[PDB]
Amino acid sequence: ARGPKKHLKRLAAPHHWLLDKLSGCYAPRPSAGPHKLRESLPLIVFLRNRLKYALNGREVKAILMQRHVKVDGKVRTDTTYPAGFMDVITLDATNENFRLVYDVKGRFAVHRITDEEASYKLGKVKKVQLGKKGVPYVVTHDGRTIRYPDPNIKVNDTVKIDLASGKITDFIKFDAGKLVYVTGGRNLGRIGTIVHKERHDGGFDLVHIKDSLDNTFVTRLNNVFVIGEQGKPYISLPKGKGIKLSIAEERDRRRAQQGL
Amino acid sequence: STELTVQSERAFQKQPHIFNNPKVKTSKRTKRWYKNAGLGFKTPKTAIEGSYIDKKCPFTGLVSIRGKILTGTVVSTKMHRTIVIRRAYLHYIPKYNRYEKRHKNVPVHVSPAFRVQVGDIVTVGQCRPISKTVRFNVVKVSAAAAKANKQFAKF
Amino acid sequence: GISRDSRHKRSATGAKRAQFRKKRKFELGRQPANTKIGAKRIHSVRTRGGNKKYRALRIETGNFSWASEGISKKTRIAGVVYHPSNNELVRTNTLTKAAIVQIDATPFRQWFEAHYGQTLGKKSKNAERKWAARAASAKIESSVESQFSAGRLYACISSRPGQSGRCDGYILEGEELAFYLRRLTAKK
Amino acid sequence: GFPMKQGVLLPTRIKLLLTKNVSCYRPRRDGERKRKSVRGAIVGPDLAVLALVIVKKGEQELEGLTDTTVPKRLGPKRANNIRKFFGLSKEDDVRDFVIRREVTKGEKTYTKAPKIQRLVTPQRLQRKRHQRALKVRNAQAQREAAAEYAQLLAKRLSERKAEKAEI
Amino acid sequence: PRAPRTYSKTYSTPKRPYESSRLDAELKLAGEFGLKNKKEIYRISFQLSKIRRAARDLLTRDEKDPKRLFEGNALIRRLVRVGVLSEDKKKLDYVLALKVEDFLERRLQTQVYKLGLAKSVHHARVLITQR
RNA sequence: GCCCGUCGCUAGUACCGAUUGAAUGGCUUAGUGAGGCCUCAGGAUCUGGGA
RNA sequence: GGACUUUUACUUUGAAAAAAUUAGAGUGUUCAAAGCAGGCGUAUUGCUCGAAUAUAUUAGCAUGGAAUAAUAGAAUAGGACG
RNA sequence: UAUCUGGUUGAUCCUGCCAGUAGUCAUAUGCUUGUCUCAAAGAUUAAGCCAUGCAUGUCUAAGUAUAAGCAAUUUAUACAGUGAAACUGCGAAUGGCUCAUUAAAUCAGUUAUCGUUUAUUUGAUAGUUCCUUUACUACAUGGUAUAACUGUGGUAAUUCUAGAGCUAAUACAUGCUUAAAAUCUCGACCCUUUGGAAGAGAUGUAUUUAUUAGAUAAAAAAUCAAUGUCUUCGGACUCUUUGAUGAUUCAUAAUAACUUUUCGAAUCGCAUGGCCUUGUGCUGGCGAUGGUUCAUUCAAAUUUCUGCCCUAUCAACUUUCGAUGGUAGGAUAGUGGCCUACCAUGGUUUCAACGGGUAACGGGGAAUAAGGGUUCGAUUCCGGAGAGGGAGCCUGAGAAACGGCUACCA
Ligand SMILES: [Mg+2]
Ligand SMILES: [Mg+2]
Ligand SMILES: [Mg+2]
Ligand SMILES: [Mg+2]
Ligand SMILES: [Mg+2]
Ligand SMILES: [Mg+2]
Ligand SMILES: [Mg+2]
Ligand SMILES: [Mg+2]
Ligand SMILES: [Mg+2]
Ligand SMILES: [Mg+2]
Ligand SMILES: [Mg+2]
Ligand SMILES: [Mg+2]
Ligand SMILES: [Mg+2]
Ligand SMILES: [Mg+2]
Ligand SMILES: [Mg+2]
Ligand SMILES: [Mg+2]
Ligand SMILES: [Mg+2]
Ligand SMILES: [Mg+2]
Ligand SMILES: [Mg+2]
Ligand SMILES: [Mg+2]
Ligand SMILES: [Mg+2]
Ligand SMILES: [Mg+2]
Ligand SMILES: [Mg+2]
Ligand SMILES: [Mg+2]
Ligand SMILES: [Mg+2]
Ligand SMILES: [Mg+2]
Ligand SMILES: [Mg+2]
Ligand SMILES: [Mg+2]
Ligand SMILES: [Mg+2]
Ligand SMILES: [Mg+2]
Ligand SMILES: [Mg+2]
Ligand SMILES: [Mg+2]
Ligand SMILES: [Mg+2]
Ligand SMILES: [Mg+2]
Ligand SMILES: [Mg+2]
């Protein structure tokens, strides 16, 4: 219908935002950017709804316009800037670094990270073509163009990225038995090594995952984000380490912790 | 369907950008191009041995098979270079807890690398809009004729 | 204006479809360039999203290439002489792709003789080297050599003049030339 | 009160489609044309007013016209235009040839000259200096990272021939 | 364009409008707990009704089924919590039994009377509604 | 005892029916055909073949 | 990587899967319909649990099963293996 | 949350309907009406008609200020604060409303783009622009023609505007530039060989065409035509370079040319410093706005499989004037009968085609509670469609737009 849509009705907004039903009628529509709409956390939601640092939306603009807040290094002054998985939100005041990395319920958790882990990010390479003048390039789930990468690097591999400068300092091949973060589906936020991948020529390679609790499950290869080695990840994982416990399991953990 | 003539049109039939240099004396006249459509569909030898042109051929032409792969039994071969198959199936009506016979006819392009007749079961592959109605291309005959030569004369 | 929807047009059953919605501009079609010969006259046309298309109406020169010699020259376009789609294109000398034309030869002459040192139909140092280097290669082809006497070469337009403002093509050669030669006279 | 329109001919009115950049019409919106009445360009007795320009001054003076002379409101503001409304050669320096309009604040008589544009200035050359400098600087860097990749492949090849000599 | 503010009703009417026996049995409840409406009884018998449905539904799944154990325990503990369900018969075939007066016995109305402090179900009302 | 139909009253409904009856809405032949768009020309004026 | 494969129905588990609605957990909106809150202290400079789960079927996908019901095969041998 | 009761008889048992009974996010109306919270609401009939007001405008240090504007102070004799008007840029294609049309359409779930367009956001990305190439081309920066304004006017009347006179740019229109090198074709001369050469041009990107590379399914040889690098002068060639996909004529590159030639910064804000042969030389900081190509993101457009209410008192339908396919073109953003030519005779149907009806927008959903079902969904979210009716189109990345224009009808 006639052109780009500019609004987002509350209720149409993604759920893992934990937006609330009333108090309005719209939600912030994520700017065009590095991450898809429906898999992002816009700056307004994070500064206000998570960190509680502003109350008003109007205050969130006042905060950003001082250039306090910088994503992946750069300063970012877009109330609805589409922040998303693997990024690094930083508050110059309050000396505070974060990474956007998933819960186990499938939500973006607040996750405080070190001042120096904050100087690089991970990126799944999504494609690698041969660009203009013979110069080969890789492109990462967060839309970064990196020229002259390792030949050995190909699609579905993850890649450590300088932030400080553009470049790739390391990569991890997609091999049977590599630490995997699950970015999508119901199994979103789970973490678990890899068993083996169903091929299926024509569409939708499946990837069989097993975590550190010898529980198993499957997703589409598309939904698989390599992040390291058995034991050894390459970023600090948020508490609970994406293991996913039964409702009964979680009930008990929560009603075992009680002796005030 | 095609058969005979090959150069039978007002325009000259040729595979595009497949130059044969008249200067260079060759023993085959026409240099031919082909591919394997993929998904494990044997590009039959009649498409390589052939001389027909059909740009809408999955092995010799500039179509591409991607998407749905379907089977059905041939019910109409009256159209030049395209057939019509019937895909039958049973459709489940919950209230009665029973199914009824239904069917659909899908029209599909058939390259003169195949020789199809009515009753042949045929595996077709989805391709780009190739005509007003045809969105599929015959990609393998899982048939033969249904024992025709076992209908010859007397002893 | 011209629509390219399928939503007119009976369904494959033959059924008559109601009108749902009006003409959108993204299914639009525009009119034919119907380009002719002579004195450069092209009109840009603003097509979806910026993107110019060039509508040639009247062209006199195009860039034509002799494939087997791997060169390309810019010649006059003499005339249209055969067209598989519609004869009115031939009779009104209309340029479109597929059209069979005649061009000039004298640029493809001036190249040949200056490169082979042989001349069609009927003293420098390095030249003699290069000329003698070539040949056993200068053999051309009868049905193409003949045309030079006439000073006009048969060629098949390969560009889309109504689209790109270019009227380009290749010389006719060997197999495909024989095809039109037969059609030419066995219709003449 | 409908206006004439040069080149309609006719000594009557008509209704035309008018566009941007055309007399008797000021478009209210991007790519808008309004269909408006217009009077012809041929003088008839219906005209309330005939617009006229003097081209040769006859043998006598017309009071409020030849006898009075009204000054041109604005003066030259672009660099070379001052240079041409005085004829100066790119040597003479404009800044003192810009025009100066006095005015009073009751007991403060002021002075306000334009703002010469397309003036060549030190600032501007620093930006020209900078552009070129960046262009070339990049250019070399881009060769480097290129040649760096040649190496990354050259001693990768001689690792597939140190591998192809192990077995 | 807003979120539908959701509601639902909290009572249910009797099928048969004039059943002399249900009628007596109903008033007697009011007389005993100081209600003003048959609705106040309708309200509860409806609550009761669904609880039983929840309990029935759960009871048809196999013993030690995950939902059953989770949703079963949850139901029971909540009932205990307000003191409707007996500590002993804490296993939901008595939530299946149960009955209206077990619910009535826990209204503030009724507690504010039970340990004196009102000495009448009605004086109990008046005191409560009067801050 | 029951009870059937013509015939007679009041009231209501639907049918048939001269009027080649009427009205609304959807398509649509043939004829006439606005307007913009494209196109062959045009050239008030206004510059360096173009506007 | 090559070289080839009788067709299906049924059923199992699973992916891919909007939110509000519904079913349903946790939380004493004073109750409740609701809401997704809230709860703790050093109440002078913070501590912390949450924001589940289920259903989501007909079709398409992916996998296990081989009963039930179809289909095809070798009889003018133009059969099968080498 | 698995219940029935009244009514045919003299009485009886049945069949069977009418009546009762209960719910309705289901409307109306009547009577009655005190408190907290919650809060639907001109859908239904008339997508009937509308007085008046309002609902789209927008400025940062950072495109344009001689307001004959305000401010004055505080350094500014080109400008500098602030700033109406106006130009320029961006937006007005979102939103909100409504449910008329629409029955294989929409819509849902599920696919496809190896079938395309994509402002913007984000990330990459540009040493090549001139010219027979020593008496040279503005680069220390090339052209005017306009608003606002000033003044003269016209009409009963409008967001009507005319004649005159000015003047800006990130508006309009132009137009210079930069290393080394390598490879190509020409080739003045010299000499016979097996043969080699000064030096002359050409080569950014984009456009259009033609040609070529883009290997790999396990291994080897001979000969023709051209012709590479290394001589231990019969000869050898030894290491020999390769991206992605299920799949491509893919990504990318190479050759010959083509172009009323796309882009390659004549822009702006803050700082003002290094550096000597003391030229105001040569350099040089932070970041704005631009800019081609690619990627990304917001999109769009088409698209595969299956699924719709009643109807035979609709059985055959489709090709007048495309109906179903083939070839070629044209047109499009692009596939495609989309359109045109030529050619063919196809396409659908009792497994219900085609036609008719719908007091029909589809979906999420809603009401009724043993289960199976029945009925409803104009209407808070998603999709679609419209703006009194039809058609046309301008602008633009995006409209076949209606709080845009043009025409006809009312
Ligand atoms: Mg926004
Ligand atoms: Mg795919
Ligand atoms: Mg046919
Ligand atoms: Mg025309
Ligand atoms: Mg300037
Ligand atoms: Mg299932
Ligand atoms: Mg939920
Ligand atoms: Mg009676
Ligand atoms: Mg009786
Ligand atoms: Mg009696
Ligand atoms: Mg009843
Ligand atoms: Mg209405
Ligand atoms: Mg309404
Ligand atoms: Mg001023
Ligand atoms: Mg809208
Ligand atoms: Mg001018
Ligand atoms: Mg410009
Ligand atoms: Mg080879
Ligand atoms: Mg390869
Ligand atoms: Mg290509
Ligand atoms: Mg200085
Ligand atoms: Mg009827
Ligand atoms: Mg065709
Ligand atoms: Mg026929
Ligand atoms: Mg029927
Ligand atoms: Mg309707
Ligand atoms: Mg609806
Ligand atoms: Mg309905
Ligand atoms: Mg309605
Ligand atoms: Mg519309
Ligand atoms: Mg109206
Ligand atoms: Mg009409
Ligand atoms: Mg309109
Ligand atoms: Mg309005
Ligand atoms: Mg509007």
Side-chain angles (χ1 to χ4, degrees), chain A, chain B residues 1-146 148 153, chain C, chain D residues 1-159 162 164-165, chain E:
Chain A
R2 286 205 291 133
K5 234 121 174 287
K6 259 65 243 242
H7 290 39
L8 223 189
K9 307 201 160 131
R10 226 174 191 96
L11 290 199
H15 203 219
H16 73 78
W17 280 6
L18 311 172
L19 285 181
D20 78 79
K21 292 213 277 177
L22 297 337
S23 73
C25 137
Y26 305 105
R29 191 182 205 293
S31 295
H35 302 279
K36 303 277 225 302
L37 194 317
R38 285 207 141 256
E39 53 197 31
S40 85
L41 209 158
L43 292 181
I44 170 153
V45 186
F46 184 82
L47 260 31
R48 176 198 90 210
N49 290 350
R50 296 296 86 87
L51 309 190
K52 314 301 173 189
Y53 271 143
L55 304 217
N56 290 346
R58 167 196 76 77
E59 253 156 44
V60 183
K61 204 133 69 270
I63 284 179
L64 277 142
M65 282 298 175
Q66 268 133 254
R67 307 183 149 253
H68 278 295
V69 21
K70 46 158 83 184
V71 200
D72 275 349
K74 298 189 73 183
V75 174
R76 251 76 262 189
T77 166
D78 177 334
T79 306
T80 65
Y81 184 91
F85 188 68
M86 277 299 171
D87 290 326
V88 162
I89 287 157
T90 300
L91 277 12
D92 268 341
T94 97
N95 313 345
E96 245 177 333
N97 304 290
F98 299 76
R99 174 154 276 138
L100 295 202
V101 19
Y102 291 112
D103 273 344
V104 200
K105 306 288 190 166
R107 326 176 265 200
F108 280 108
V110 165
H111 178 56
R112 282 159 184 90
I113 67 157
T114 101
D115 226 62
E116 158 233 357
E117 188 206 15
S119 276
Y120 75 84
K121 94 193 297 179
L122 252 31
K124 161 169 197 167
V125 350
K126 275 243 176 76
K127 84 170 65 213
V128 46
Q129 305 201 0
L130 207 284
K132 244 92 213 321
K133 280 184 199 301
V135 187
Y137 63 104
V138 284
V139 177
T140 68
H141 78 285
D142 71 326
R144 299 173 146 277
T145 309
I146 306 157
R147 331 220 293 144
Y148 300 123
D150 207 308
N152 288 13
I153 291 181
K154 3 229 53 178
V155 186
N156 299 324
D157 298 337
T158 173
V159 143
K160 188 169 179 183
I161 303 160
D162 190 32
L163 296 205
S165 191
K167 325 266 195 76
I168 296 177
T169 76
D170 194 3
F171 58 98
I172 295 94
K173 288 215 72 63
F174 199 96
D175 288 21
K178 294 271 186 322
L179 238 201
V180 157
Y181 222 150
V182 176
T183 61
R186 217 290 129 201
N187 296 333
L188 165 76
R190 300 244 286 203
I191 324 189
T193 67
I194 283 186
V195 172
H196 114 290
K197 143 239 269 262
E198 295 178 36
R199 204 210 184 184
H200 286 305
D201 293 324
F204 299 138
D205 299 45
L206 301 187
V207 176
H208 292 267
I209 316 293
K210 98 158 190 59
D211 73 83
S212 64
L213 221 60
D214 241 57
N215 278 335
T216 67
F217 59 113
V218 206
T219 40
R220 312 237 257 215
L221 177 284
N222 150 61
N223 263 348
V224 176
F225 197 127
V226 262
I227 38 162
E229 300 283 50
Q230 174 76 105
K232 314 133 187 142
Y234 279 52
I235 42 107
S236 22
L237 323 178
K239 55 261 106 200
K241 271 101 284 175
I243 306 305
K244 171 141 190 180
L245 331 79
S246 105
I247 41 171
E249 292 185 78
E250 285 181 29
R251 173 242 300 168
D252 295 330
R253 284 203 175 177
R254 291 192 195 130
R255 260 162 40 99
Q257 231 279 88
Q258 114 281 132
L260 315 184
Chain B
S1 284
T2 307
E3 150 164 5
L4 302 190
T5 72
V6 46
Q7 228 55 264
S8 90
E9 213 80 47
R10 292 201 63 100
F12 189 73
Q13 305 300 284
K14 59 204 288 194
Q15 287 189 310
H17 307 325
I18 313 296
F19 185 21
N20 15 32
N21 192 346
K23 254 182 164 191
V24 172
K25 316 310 182 185
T26 224
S27 76
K28 62 267 201 317
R29 288 182 78 85
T30 301
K31 177 174 188 302
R32 189 191 196 75
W33 175 94
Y34 65 89
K35 61 194 157 80
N36 112 272
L39 273 20
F41 295 108
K42 242 293 184 179
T43 125
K45 312 290 288 174
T46 66
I48 304 182
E49 302 182 356
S51 60
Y52 73 86
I53 233 59
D54 192 2
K55 53 158 153 171
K56 305 171 187 200
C57 170
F59 324 100
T60 61
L62 309 127
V63 277
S64 96
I65 287 141
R66 75 297 126 103
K68 251 69 202 306
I69 287 100
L70 304 173
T71 30
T73 102
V74 170
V75 79
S76 186
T77 61
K78 324 266 286 304
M79 282 156 69
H80 180 248
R81 266 194 194 178
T82 138
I83 64 177
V84 175
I85 73 186
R86 159 180 280 213
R87 308 207 331 131
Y89 65 85
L90 286 169
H91 175 266
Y92 180 80
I93 282 126
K95 164 174 178 179
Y96 282 105
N97 204 282
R98 329 206 169 195
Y99 313 68
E100 59 187 13
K101 307 217 202 110
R102 292 189 176 187
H103 88 267
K104 272 153 181 45
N105 294 7
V106 199
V108 28
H109 196 290
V110 52
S111 145
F114 297 115
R115 277 164 259 139
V116 158
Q117 95 131 124
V118 157
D120 298 3
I121 284 105
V122 119
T123 302
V124 308
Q126 213 219 269
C127 53
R128 81 160 202 269
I130 244 346
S131 74
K132 157 131 196 258
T133 74
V134 171
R135 278 94 185 101
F136 287 84
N137 213 320
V138 179
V139 112
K140 145 160 151 167
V141 174
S142 4
Chain C
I2 301 166
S3 175
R4 292 155 34 244
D5 73 330
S6 258
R7 185 91 213 305
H8 67 251
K9 206 103 188 180
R10 298 182 168 263
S11 55
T13 30
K16 198 211 229 155
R17 315 204 251 208
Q19 178 199 74
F20 114 100
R21 101 187 171 179
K22 312 184 188 225
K23 296 191 146 147
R24 304 272 145 88
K25 132 115 181 71
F26 55 66
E27 43 200 12
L28 149 184
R30 285 190 271 265
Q31 309 189 259
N34 281 314
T35 141
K36 321 299 210 78
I37 285 150
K40 186 175 288 170
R41 180 189 280 180
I42 313 175
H43 293 177
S44 62
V45 7
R46 197 266 180 185
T47 77
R48 188 162 226 250
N51 303 307
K52 283 169 200 294
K53 232 184 283 181
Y54 297 87
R55 201 119 282 165
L57 9 120
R58 305 178 191 201
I59 274 184
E60 75 202 336
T61 89
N63 173 75
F64 291 77
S65 52
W66 200 348
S68 107
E69 303 309 319
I71 80 164
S72 318
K73 247 60 156 53
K74 158 183 156 162
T75 45
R76 280 191 300 262
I77 290 177
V80 166
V81 94
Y82 183 97
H83 194 299
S85 284
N86 196 322
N87 274 260
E88 287 315 281
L89 303 168
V90 176
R91 154 166 35 199
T92 74
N93 271 10
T94 302
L95 294 175
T96 82
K97 187 194 176 193
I100 306 288
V101 296
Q102 287 183 323
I103 33 181
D104 206 288
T106 78
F108 297 89
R109 161 168 264 118
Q110 289 176 12
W111 173 82
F112 190 86
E113 319 192 344
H115 181 269
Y116 273 96
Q118 296 258 19
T119 88
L120 287 320
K122 301 224 67 52
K123 199 249 150 281
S124 184
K125 332 294 176 186
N126 334 21
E128 228 74 38
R129 281 194 187 98
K130 316 204 203 64
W131 283 339
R134 315 149 180 168
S137 185
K139 232 286 105 181
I140 331 109
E141 213 195 315
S142 349
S143 54
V144 186
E145 176 147 4
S146 349
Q147 319 203 37
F148 275 98
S149 326
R152 287 185 212 297
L153 300 190
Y154 288 120
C156 169
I157 306 291
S158 61
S159 58
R160 271 163 64 84
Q163 301 290 299
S164 60
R166 314 308 181 81
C167 186
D168 292 339
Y170 57 103
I171 289 172
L172 248 55
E173 206 150 7
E175 219 353 86
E176 156 190 16
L177 162 60
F179 183 75
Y180 298 106
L181 269 204
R182 202 175 299 102
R183 295 282 178 286
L184 249 0
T185 67
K187 190 186 181 311
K188 284 174 158 77
Chain D
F2 300 93
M4 314 201 205
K5 194 184 185 55
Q6 162 132 251
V8 275
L9 300 329
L10 277 41
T12 84
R13 276 217 289 271
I14 54 192
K15 253 166 156 290
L16 299 195
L17 227 213
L18 294 172
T19 357
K20 93 221 81 55
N21 288 315
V22 96
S23 15
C24 306
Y25 181 45
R26 185 179 70 71
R28 296 300 144 101
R29 168 168 200 166
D30 291 300
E32 159 196 44
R33 315 163 286 175
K34 232 179 249 156
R35 165 110 53 175
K36 298 166 64 65
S37 309
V38 143
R39 211 269 159 167
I42 316 177
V43 187
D46 56 288
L47 294 162
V49 161
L50 211 217
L52 298 173
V53 169
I54 286 169
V55 159
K56 271 91 72 184
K57 165 169 90 151
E59 60 191 61
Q60 183 85 299
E61 244 92 27
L62 316 179
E63 198 90 37
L65 242 51
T66 319
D67 119 287
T68 137
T69 153
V70 1
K72 270 150 58 166
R73 206 108 196 290
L74 254 32
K77 179 189 149 89
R78 201 226 304 273
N80 285 327
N81 270 355
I82 293 147
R83 268 177 204 124
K84 261 59 229 188
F85 190 61
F86 289 100
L88 302 174
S89 79
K90 50 170 201 170
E91 247 91 43
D92 261 308
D93 185 329
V94 162
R95 280 91 80 79
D96 6 31
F97 281 89
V98 74
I99 211 44
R100 313 219 62 105
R101 174 176 63 113
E102 292 177 355
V103 75
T104 68
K105 194 203 158 65
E107 306 298 309
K108 193 164 210 194
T109 73
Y110 256 117
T111 165
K112 37 195 313 197
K115 158 61 143 70
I116 343 289
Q117 215 101 24
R118 232 113 97 119
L119 192 27
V120 69
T121 63
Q123 173 70 52
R124 234 175 109 199
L125 310 182
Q126 181 185 10
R127 299 211 196 99
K128 182 178 184 171
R129 187 171 329 124
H130 195 301
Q131 294 287 37
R132 293 232 182 140
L134 258 185
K135 255 186 164 195
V136 183
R137 179 183 286 127
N138 183 15
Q140 293 168 351
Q142 212 66 212
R143 244 179 283 117
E144 283 279 319
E148 201 160 89
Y149 185 85
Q151 303 150 11
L152 217 280
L153 252 166
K155 299 104 169 184
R156 189 67 60 95
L157 239 189
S158 21
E159 278 198 337
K164 237 306 187 312
Chain E
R2 298 92 76 261
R5 190 50 145 285
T6 141
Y7 56 86
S8 47
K9 67 180 310 192
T10 61
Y11 68 106
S12 173
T13 161
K15 234 177 162 306
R16 285 168 183 266
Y18 302 123
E19 187 159 353
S20 207
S21 64
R22 171 192 53 87
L23 268 190
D24 291 339
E26 276 162 352
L27 210 186
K28 273 167 193 177
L29 269 199
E32 277 188 66
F33 300 90
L35 318 172
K36 105 160 162 175
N37 286 336
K38 258 69 162 42
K39 196 183 293 118
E40 298 196 275
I41 299 166
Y42 296 160
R43 162 166 56 198
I44 303 308
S45 22
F46 176 69
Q47 306 175 338
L48 202 254
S49 159
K50 318 199 268 199
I51 276 178
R52 294 179 41 81
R53 175 226 26 101
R56 272 185 290 233
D57 279 22
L58 292 173
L59 253 285
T60 64
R61 329 190 65 85
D62 144 61
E63 199 197 39
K64 288 221 171 169
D65 171 296
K67 191 172 179 262
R68 178 175 173 163
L69 294 153
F70 189 84
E71 303 231 337
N73 262 322
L75 179 60
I76 307 179
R77 89 114 224 182
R78 255 205 332 268
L79 299 147
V80 174
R81 234 262 218 98
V82 289
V84 171
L85 200 57
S86 50
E87 208 72 15
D88 2 75
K89 328 304 172 193
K90 184 190 278 180
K91 268 282 87 62
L92 116 162
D93 301 32
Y94 178 41
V95 317
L96 233 209
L98 223 21
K99 82 183 169 200
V100 201
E101 288 119 330
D102 292 306
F103 280 87
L104 274 350
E105 209 73 17
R106 304 302 301 189
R107 326 183 57 234
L108 204 231
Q109 164 93 115
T110 48
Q111 286 301 308
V112 124
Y113 162 69
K114 242 42 187 161
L115 190 64
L117 216 137
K119 264 178 82 310
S120 164
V121 292
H122 310 120
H123 181 92
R125 271 284 192 119
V126 186
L127 286 182
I128 302 180
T129 173
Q130 283 182 335
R131 324 276 303 283

